[model samples]
Target chain A: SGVQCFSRYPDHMKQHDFFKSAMPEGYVQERTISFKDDGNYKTRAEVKFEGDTLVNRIELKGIDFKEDGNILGHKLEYNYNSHNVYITADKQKNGIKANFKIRHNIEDGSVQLADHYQQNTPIGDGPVLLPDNHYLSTQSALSKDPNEKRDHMVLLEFVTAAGI
Target chain B: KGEELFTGVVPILVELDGDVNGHKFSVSGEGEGDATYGKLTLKFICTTGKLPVPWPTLVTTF
Candidate 1:
């Protein structure tokens, strides 16, 4: 069977090589596609293969840069290696659930699964403001399924003081 | 003596909520810093299911 692959980066066009590394062996080359976002700021690219006729989608969200001691916010700048990567098999498989274990790739350890139980609560009416500055701002219910145990929602304060 | 200069405090906050066990988990932190490009010090405190605990300390450079 013959396979072909193509990729592109809309914002950082120079970083196109990062996407090439994901290509499997024995894949044929196809044309790379790039799209620019005028409103709300985003860069998207679509890669397709010729042999098996498969299309892979890539999107970069929330890109910002620092200059002259100021954080200049721009549309998301994404690279295949530096940016977030989410790959799906053959597409059309929505709401897929899987458990992933960490091994050699410790740097990429965060889970990118969909938020099954996501809710927002007002900060003022939430839990009392603690003296240490930690308080319960919002609450919600989350679970893998109705048959599984339910976990209470807790939103951690994003303190800039910690050098995040 | 030079005139007194009043330095105001700057605060930024972020929160994450999840469960590792049956116990409710909550964590929080606060800190202040200047606008200049330099080092920063941060203080944090966490509570589990309404239980108070000491906050973790962090230092960062901008």
Candidate 2:
């Protein structure tokens, strides 16, 4: 999945190293990944440092709602910006917390897993939206198992993209 | 003449809360970068579920 997950600004860090000291002043980066199959949706991950504040944000947007029109018991239409989930973080506020619009379609709206993202409570058999911007239904609303986890492991390596 | 650049690793934790195939999901990983190219590589660490099958060791670069 080489898709660009949505982020606000271009990652100013892509040209730099991972070290904070190596980053130039006022560096910003935004990465995005868009999905077209599920009625158009996208995700954005961004990071930047302004003054003494280190800002990091992960946002999810539901650009189209042909499939997931009924959200939180509210039926939406195409080009609806109704679905929103914000996982914002900083050195100031303990790292991360989720803020979303729809609460009725979720199981336990109270569990925050380590402030990274809210934990998913089994719906038994029904449509449920997780704080991480995941919209799932027990029915065949998706490709894979709607109840299973899909997160994978990643390893970092420096490869030459092109000769400079 | 040739140019040289190097930057150390912060190994900071980066998480993305998003959806896939209509299912809600989250990806947690270590954020690494290349100073010369300004490339960010998200070295994924773990997941919420234990032993999630067919673990994809994907090196997400940006």
Candidate 3:
């Protein structure tokens, strides 16, 4: 149902340029979100494992529509509280594993125009790259809610650390 | 009536158990989200123990 591969660094772990220079020392993961037709607006969220604890941070400046008079008091918010990431690894064995999911909501103080959710890791089906145990997933969607009288577009990418 | 914004949750469940260098380790995690809207939540844990030397964690959100 999913693509899976196992790679062994037969040479030296640090011998590869990607492992020594490119890859970070610890677990790192990142996600970027874009919307609209040309994708001019871009926002991001990240998660890193800090000694068994996963911390998350988000930047909403790119998508901040507060100044727009069209939708005053309305928001298209990425619910950070609902975000979660889990990573486990063994340095001696050169093995690692992880999983995570996130959600977005359109709110008008009380009611919501719509909701969007996504999950990439541990993919159930389709083509998600798993090269050198580094997983990458790209997903996009476009639809008309009919109720909002507007179109919704979602494009996102997820990437994990590699060369460990 | 408005069309459904989301269809259903596409659950993802996978794991890896192996070793590299001299370290023997195991890790497992799970995730779920809407099939159309895609994955929106993430959570995981690492049981790889401590490394020989401390290194900084990298984080970017832009």
Candidate 4:
């Protein structure tokens, strides 16, 4: 299958981090993927929001077989990526773009976006931290069929983002 | 025939700026992005069967 995500690759397993600085005290954000159905994953986190706001930012790179497949147990064959992000207090959003690295295995055959797919707010005010009341949402169309017909949707979510 | 599992990390950096409700912002960070994990199961079944060792005679001998 095909998907890109990150976490401490499992020794028994393998493969990922994000943070928030400027919320009440017990601020936490939860990120989830419905499968929409089927894929790989890593970068598992647990931060709560008694008064904080954080969500995963969505960076969808077109599938590149170069850095794709058998990369970890063996290959960053996949290229990396970067982005500028924004979200309105109402949950509307904002973002920019740059590039970085990734690993992959094509034989698997499912389209995924788990890597850095986990983000809350990569920036604060205009450039450091999220102000207040803003939500971030990035949607990646998913389909396991190489046919290119979107089957469902992967909406990466970041509720409230804070800057350092 | 067997169960296969594949896993890996996805590192990505992003530079972004957005309208925070009405305010503007920009910044960049790189960490593990989403990742690629795979598990495959391939089972074995034989349709061409009767008795490789004569099951009926073998049982009687036992």
Which should have the higher DockQ, number 2 or number 4? 2
Question: By lDDT, is 2 or 3 better?
Answer: 2
Fnat for the candidates in order:
0.00, 0.17, 0.01, 0.03
Best prediction by TM-score: 2
Q: Which residue window of length 10 is worst by lDDT in model 1 chain A?
A: A114-123
> Order the candidates by DockQ, highest first — what do you get?
2, 3, 4, 1
> Distance (Å) between predicted and true CA of A25, model 1?
44
Interface RMSD of each: 22.0, 11.5, 19.0, 24.3
* Model 1's TM-score against the true structure: 0.20
Where does model 3 exceed 4 Å of error?
A: A1-32, A37-41, A44-46, A63-66, A69-72, A75-164, B1-62
Model 4 lDDT per residue over A1-164, tens place: 11111211233221011222221121112222221122222222222222212222322112112222332122211222222223223123332211211222233553323332333322323322223322221222111224423221121211112221
Candidate 4 Cα deviation (angstroms), residue A33: 7.4
Minimum summed lDDT over a 10-residue window in model 4 chain A is located at: A1-10
Would you give me the overall lDDT of model 4?
Answer: 0.22
Off by over 4 Å in 2: A1-41, A49-57, A61-151, A159-164, B1-6, B31-47, B50-62
State the fnat of candidate 3 relative to the true structure: 0.01
* Residue-level lDDT tens digits of model 2 in A1-164: 11111111113322211213212121223323222222333444454333322234454443443333233222321111122334333323222233333222212332111111221122122221112222211110112234535544443333221111
Preferred candidate (lDDT higher): 1 or 3? 3
- What TM-score does each of the candidates earn? 0.20, 0.33, 0.23, 0.22
**DockQ of candidate 3 against the true complex:** 0.03
- Candidate 1 per-residue lDDT over residues B1-62, each given as its tens digit: 00001022234332323222222344443333222211123333333444211111000000
What is the fnat of model 4 with respect to the true interface contacts? 0.03
Q: Candidate 1's residue-wise lDDT over A48-154, tens digit each?
A: 22242233222223222222111122112111111111221211211111111111111235221211111111112212111111111111111122342322222
